Design a protein around this ligand. Structure first.
Ligand SMILES: Nc1ncnc2c1ncn2[C@@H]1O[C@H](COP(=O)(O)OP(=O)(O)NP(=O)(O)O)[C@@H](O)[C@H]1O
Ligand SMILES: Nc1ncnc2c1ncn2[C@@H]1O[C@H](COP(=O)(O)OP(=O)(O)O)[C@@H](O)[C@H]1O
Ligand SMILES: [Mg+2]
Ligand SMILES: [Mg+2]
Lengths: 466, 54, 487, 467, 255, 128
């Protein structure tokens, strides 16, 4: 059916229909425009009138202008054909590489998997990255809060994650840029081309990109998370995959919902957030999970307003996170790559009842020794390293080797560095650190453990250093 | 003996003062953020109450 | 005809409620009988909410309002250079009509992801602290932020003044056309400003777009976009423009007035839910274009005023988040004698090195590191009697590098002059010089190398870096000059 | 054209007209009143009804009461006949001395001078007030603002300025009392009769007075600043002359607007203020200016609600000024008067190329030592003095001496200080702070520098204190 | 009624915090939109128009007056808040009281630095002005220096003197309830302190000294007190007489 | 059902902070006036009426009981906040769990000084 615009107030458009009304969340296609203008139904105001939120600018709209009800929420291309491609919130290609020739489309709004569809098991998603897997491992179908920002190897980690999950688990990735800066979205794209996680020439692209750029209206930036999520859901549900979804970043998803809520005239809640803060987050996050058919695991860049962890935005997000990966500038300046802080990063599944008593005792042993080494550093600056007890001398020696064996060369960085990237199985990670703690390599030099994969390569590097 | 005792004591005193300050910083930071949030909400309620009364 | 004309139902507070105008487009410019313009912001079932470009006194109940085929565009081109215009491009300098041969809508979409290339080309401020530790590239958006009266406008003015050295030169690539947008300032302030640029001979390559404090809110709202379109003319024809929005706090206040008066919903600090969108669409129009699009660029320096250092207030939060980095200015640094009052620990440029010449990249990296080492130990300076030699040195180097980041107003520096000054500090030559004498040393040292050692400065610029030869030259200039200075 | 009152709520009156609707800003005259009651048109509400703000009390008004459109905005007497007179918002005499017999009147609403009308000349106006002259000097034809919370010393400062600068001024002055104390208005008036700058017997008066104080309803207080400004504009333009405009207090214009705002139907902006705060201030402030035709040195007292300088009203005011004198309760509380924050006061002419390098250097040196001391305070208040280096504690002693030498007995403040008023020439100010900084008075006690004029008085006081 | 008929009245508004709350209530129920802190936008005017009506009339209007002491209750000691500053911005000064002072034994619990009169010595008899003229600024500097000197190490002669004076004046301005003092008695007492005759008396004895001194001058020197009250001033003769009384009496008191 | 039929039930409300957030969404969407932390004035009553229903019945009413263990999430240990205080003012004591103790591996991370049972002592076995 065909409706008429009766009001335009910024990104809020009211449309009157003469017969059956489009239900809430339906996509409407505005007629007589140079480019696609999608309105999403938000409310039924009564008197045959719906209130909608615009997915693009509303300049030039006239009252009485025709609006076609699509009969469904925003539907976007889903399938292998999205991989290596960049779409927007309504599923149009924005990479100038022509149509996305998928055979399936999917609605961006879906209810979360039912209670019966839930996996009752908790498993590690092995990343092949030593720090992460050992100390703060990712849960399959879990949410990971990524802290850091710029200058700390964030993109490189994201790209390595995409690389390793495809290699180790056969699972593709989706990157959702929520409030993406156009300059940075361009640079991310070519970085992904250069690393090879995206391929323009063949069909070996591992990641689909979805951009909700900053200059787009609140409604678009609010919904892109869902578009990205919908792309990921095809790989879980239709292809049984263990998928990766990056949301960059979640605070901008929250903020876009706060802006839309304001536009709709809803009374703001505490600190100005939408009254629907928790449900906006919940209806989205709950779609990310392990089902009986597969999983979606989400790495989510976190911005903490005013550095206040008790702010409604991070507090609401943290209810959903099973882990944190903390990237640190201090760690990067020590030449440790990936620049993950080994004490600051945490995981909810670092539990003997989930990862096993052995993994748990080794991780806890690495944490302890690192903590202990921090306690001695003041005494080193005061008394010197030759004034430590023979037990304390040994903890410095071992801690420092452990600090180095937590670093690791990445495949995605083979161009810039020249060295071969390493994807290390969990049992080898566990074994490597188990042996350094036990004092099996007290005789080996400290630098042998730097930028290596498995523990054998540290032995082989010790031999190569004459 | 005097100087060994005094420098040990100053070290302990200062270590204690440093850790105290550290605890006071944390506490004031929490107080700061509780107030910050209250201020934003209060201001917002005044605006909405003013608006809805029209 | 209530399709093409309307009737004022009510008028007050710069809002006219108009019956009719059934065929108005959203955001269309319409015209009242008196000749005042208005923009159609609210299209409602029984009225249009029209925002008034002038005094309400001239609009009365029942006044006829017309569509005219109006388009909200501005004059655009080199004919604006050296001119002061209002928000709509009208000359306000009393020097006659703009000779403009082209026009451009104020409201246009930013270039998308594809037409761009990585920000690479230096945008040289001439300000040591910035060019070294917060470097800006062509196409970047870099925010100038701090409380009232901390030096924000001066950063921009010195940046505009600096470009003369390139615009006078013979390298067309290096040239940079400047646009200063004044929003909500007082007229005499803008007048002092253009006098400054006139005296500096910078006006010839600068457009001043001015919507001052007695201009109606819609005009202040449009001005940034107007200046932005004038800058896009350069971006889109293989040239480079720099735009300053001074300032965006004032533009957002103007928009809030309009939104509140249209009875659009209020949120945090009474701003509407589209104020982020307001600023994001403006700032994404700064871009570096790829070669297929001519290779031009538009760099933006938005200005934000904070209140008592609150970088987490609503509008600073938005604009910090939108931009590529921030230059934070602080009151206490100012009165300490740190002028420009740049907080070098907090200030950031995410473009960073990619926007620096090799020569600067060298010394700036060393300086960044040594200033960070200093900052760790800084509080133990005025309470440090019995510190070890190492920590004594970190302080010594820090205080001296800090002194070298001080800079007078209206005297932006060639990049090679900047590196030669920083060299003296990072290579330890001033470590035994009493810190109070550094600014005096630099001024005299620089005067001397400019006068007697043009060849050396030439080579620092040409060679890209500092060679073994340049290094040997500077060693001998500095040590001999220094001993003369302390004689 | 005749209209009728259809609603009254406080200061806001709605009036229906059957024929020609008065334009916005028109003065309407209420019929059947003992004293003239003017309503100013604020909005056309539709249905032939206008919303107005009253210029006096609305008590006694009746629905149906007749109102005449005058045909123009509030028009007041301007010219030499205003000199030595007191006028109210609507230009009526309130000094009980009969008609103001001007040849001409002017509307209180006018366009602001254009950009091409601006002047860029700026030369020092010496005040004889050390802290102002040294750190943040005023400029002739400049826009000066005195910010302070309740009872920190704004009005005492403006009166000292009137005393030091306006008494021996060659041209005319206007003083606009805006939303302040009626007592203060009677004080000023009789003081000016006593000094002879107002003369009730001849034509030698140099000051025009315009008052609408805090006994007045918000309409009077929101417009009385314009009345005062309109008087000064005439003198500026239709005599091209050097005019001094003193306004106490310009905040009360913004506050008055906030009082009627809800009744005018606005959603409030932040902190309970009208959404139009900044444009309202802009159209008013941009008329308060020197032009090419003539100069206005404007001095405006600026109230700071709840002592918060980030309050929208004072925060929006800063950008309108060429020099700012910021007063601090924390400084007043120490007995340091005038209570000027030496680290929050600014001036466009504070530049080595304008005031010279000696004045600039001394000012920045003073500001530097005071900031250095400020960052040391809280630190040494816990860790002790004896932990300081013998050069760090020298900045402390010097800074604390400089804090006190910034204080000064005002002539207008004798009833508060018990000290005789002092005026200090620019060069003496420079020399004094220059000598302290150089270490010339490290031996003299702190208190010797407290509450005196020139440096020599600190030396003499140190002797008195010896016994 | 007194003000306009040649008489003088004093009015106490106890209190205006509660009145502003009642106005708020009444305004909200009238459907007048709330402003800052839910008070109407014109809560300043509510009180400004009231207090402007306290005034001193000229002789042509009868010479009468009305004096006002409005009362405001602050929360958690914050005189800088919105409503308090509104009322401070109306009155010709304020007397600020604090619990801290009250419980330390400063009663009346007046914060000197934060209090002011905007009429000053114009409102004082010459005699009081003679003894109190510079004391308010002096006490402000005293409290500052006493805080700065807190870490008791080598203080010069000037500040030590400033301290000794300040601590003793503070004792002299302590006062009990329900016995308000005749001006000449106030002057005699303040005189002993500001003239320095108490500078070597133990500060804890000051209150005992004052009451004994007062009972002595009242009983024995009713003529000196009479002259100060009548003349409105301390003449050179009165000064000479007072000096001889306090120096010799104090010495007796200290035996 | 068990309480009133002579049997004993235990109920866990996991958690009441999230329930109050949900009720705040409902209230604000209903345009109820926001108060402290933007909660409606009936947010206490939301919890009080629910927790009053946990009860011990006397023998004349079958002797059954309903025990309630409501859960409340604090933000950085702030027990003085609006919702935490509301619930403390309802229940018969609290078990307070400290981030600091939990982090140190003291688990259950019970802060003994801050925990109480107002009525449980009479229901503790003599052996204990
Ligand atoms: N490098 C510098 N050295 C010395 N003085 C400076 C420097 N930069 C700025 N100033 C002065 O500091 C004052 C503030 O500079 P300005 O550029 O106006 O800052 P602002 O933050 O833009 N002020 P406002 O816009 O009025 O809030 C002016 O008097 C300048 O002349
Ligand atoms: N320069 C000064 N010297 C001495 N006392 C002062 C001075 N300035 C202000 N005061 C004291 O502060 C009171 C308030 O000053 P005032 O100018 O009325 O403040 P404001 O106008 O800022 O409210 C004065 O009545 C006086 O007692
Ligand atoms: Mg500026
Ligand atoms: Mg005053």
């Amino acid at each position: 059916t065909t409706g008429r615009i009766v009001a335009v107030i910024g990104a809020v458009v009211d449309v009157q229909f003469d017969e059956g009304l489009p239900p809430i969340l339906n996509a409407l296609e505005v007629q007589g425009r140079e480019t696609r203008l999608v309105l999403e139904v938000a409310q039924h105001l009564g008197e045959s009138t719906v209130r909608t939120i615009a997915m693009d600018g509303t300049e030039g709209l006239v009252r009485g202008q025709k609006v076609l009800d699509s009969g469904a929420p925003i539907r976007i291309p889903v399938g292998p054909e999205t991989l290596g491609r960049i779409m927007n919130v309504i599923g149009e290609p924005i990479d100038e590489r022509g149509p996305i020739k998928t055979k399936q489309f999917a609605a961006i709004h879906a209810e979360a998997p039912e209670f019966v569809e839930m996996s009752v098991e908790q498993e590690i998603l092995v990343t092949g990255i030593k720090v992460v897997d050992l100390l703060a491992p990712y849960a399959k179908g879990g949410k990971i809060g990524l802290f850091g920002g710029a200058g700390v190897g964030k993109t490189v980690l994201i790209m390595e994650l995409i690389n390793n999950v495809a290699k180790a688990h056969g699972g593709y990735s989706v990157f959702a840029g929520v409030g993406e800066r156009t300059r940075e979205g361009n640079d991310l794209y070519h970085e992904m081309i250069e690393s090879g996680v995206i391929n323009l020439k063949d069909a070996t692209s591992k990641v689909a990109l979805v951009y909700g750029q900053m200059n787009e209206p609140p409604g678009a930036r609010a919904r892109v998370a869902l578009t990205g999520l919908t792309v990921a859901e095809y790989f879980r549900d239709q292809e049984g995959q263990d998928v990766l979804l990056f949301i960059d970043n979640i605070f901008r998803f929250t903020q876009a919902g706060s802006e839309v809520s304001a536009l709709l005239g809803r009374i703001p809640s505490a600190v100005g957030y939408q009254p629907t803060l928790a449900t906006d987050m919940g209806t989205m996050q709950e779609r990310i999970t392990t089902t009986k058919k597969g999983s979606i695991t989400s790495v989510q860049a976190i911005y903490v307003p005013a550095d206040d962890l008790t702010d409604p935005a991070p507090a609401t997000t943290f209810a959903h996170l099973d882990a944190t990966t903390v990237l640190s500038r201090a760690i990067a300046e020590l030449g440790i790559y990936p620049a993950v802080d080994p004490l600051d990063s945490t995981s909810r599944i670092m539990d003997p009842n989930i990862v096993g008593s052995e993994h748990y005792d080794v991780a806890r042993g690495v944490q302890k020794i690192l903590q202990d080494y921090k306690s001695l550093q003041d005494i080193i600056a005061i008394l010197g390293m030759d004034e430590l007890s023979e037990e304390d001398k040994l903890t410095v020696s071992r801690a420092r080797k452990i600090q180095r064996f937590l670093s690791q060369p990445f495949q995605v960085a083979e161009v810039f560095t020249g060295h071969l990237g390493k994807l290390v199985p969990l049992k080898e990670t566990i074994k490597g650190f188990q042996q350094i703690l036990a004092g099996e390599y007290d005789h080996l030099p400290e630098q042998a453990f730097y930028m290596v994969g498995p523990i054998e390569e540290a032995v082989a590097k010790a031999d190569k250093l004459a | 003996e005097s100087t060994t005792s005094e420098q040990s004591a100053r070290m302990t005193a200062m270590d204690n003062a440093s850790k105290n300050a550290s605890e006071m910083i944390d506490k004031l930071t929490l107080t700061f953020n509780r107030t910050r949030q209250a201020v934003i909400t209060k201001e917002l309620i005044e605006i909405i109450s003013g608006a809805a009364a029209l | 005809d209530l399709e093409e004309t309307g009737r004022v139902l009510s008028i007050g507070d710069g809002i006219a409620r108009v019956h009719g105008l059934r065929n108005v487009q959203a955001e269309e410019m319409v015209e009242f009988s008196s000749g005042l313009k208005g923009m159609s912001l609210n299209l409602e079932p029984d009225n249009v909410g029209v925002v008034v470009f002038g005094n309400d006194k001239l609009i009365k109940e029942g006044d006829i309002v017309k569509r005219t085929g109006a388009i909200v565009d501005v004059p655009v081109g080199e004919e604006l250079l050296g001119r002061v215009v209002d928000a709509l491009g009208n000359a306000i300098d009393g020097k006659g009509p703009i000779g403009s041969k082209a026009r451009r809508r104020v409201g246009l979409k930013a270039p998308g992801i594809i037409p761009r290339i990585s920000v690479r080309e230096p945008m040289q401020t001439g300000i040591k602290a910035v060019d070294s530790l917060v470097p800006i590239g062509r196409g970047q958006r870099e925010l100038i932020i701090g409380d009232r009266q901390t030096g924000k406008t001066s950063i921009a003015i010195d940046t505009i003044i600096n470009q003369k050295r390139f615009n006078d030169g013979t390298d067309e690539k290096k040239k940079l056309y400047c646009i200063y947008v004044a929003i909500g300032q007082k007229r005499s302030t803008v007048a002092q400003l253009v006098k400054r640029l006139t005296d500096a001979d910078a006006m010839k390559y600068t457009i001043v777009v001015s919507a001052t404090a007695s201009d109606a809110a819609p005009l202040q709202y449009l001005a940034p976009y107007s200046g932005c379109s004038m800058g896009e003319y350069f971006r889109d024809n293989g040239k480079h423009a720099l735009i300053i929005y001074d300032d965006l706090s004032k533009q957002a206040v103007a928009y809030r007035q309009m939104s509140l008066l249209l009875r659009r919903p209020p949120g945090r600090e009474a701003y509407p839910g589209d104020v982020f969108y307001l600023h994001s669409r403006l700032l994404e129009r700064a871009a570096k274009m790829n070669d297929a699009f001519g290779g031009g660029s538009l760099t933006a320096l938005p200005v934000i005023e904070t209140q008592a250092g609150d970088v987490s207030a609503y509008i600073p939060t938005n604009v910090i988040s939108i931009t590529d980095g921030q230059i934070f200015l602080e009151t206490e640094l100012f009165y300490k004698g740190i002028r420009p009052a740049i907080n070098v620990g907090l200030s950031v440029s995410r473009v960073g090195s990619a926007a620096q010449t090799r020569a600067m990249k060298q010394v700036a990296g060393t300086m960044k590191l040594e200033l960070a080492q200093y900052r760790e130990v800084a509080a133990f300076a005025q309470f440090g009697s019995d510190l070890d030699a190492a920590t004594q040195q970190l302080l010594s180097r820090g205080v001296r590098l800090t002194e070298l980041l001080k800079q007078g107003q209206y005297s932006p520096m060639a990049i090679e002059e900047q590196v030669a000054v920083i060299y003296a500090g990072v290579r330890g030559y001033l470590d035994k010089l009493e810190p109070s004498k550094i600014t005096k040393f630099e001024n005299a040292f620089l005067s001397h190398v400019i006068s007697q050692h043009q060849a050396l400065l030439s080579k620092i610029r040409t060679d890209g870096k500092i060679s073994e030869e340049s290094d040997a030259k500077l060693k001998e200039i500095v040590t001999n000059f220094l001993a003369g200075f302390e004689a």
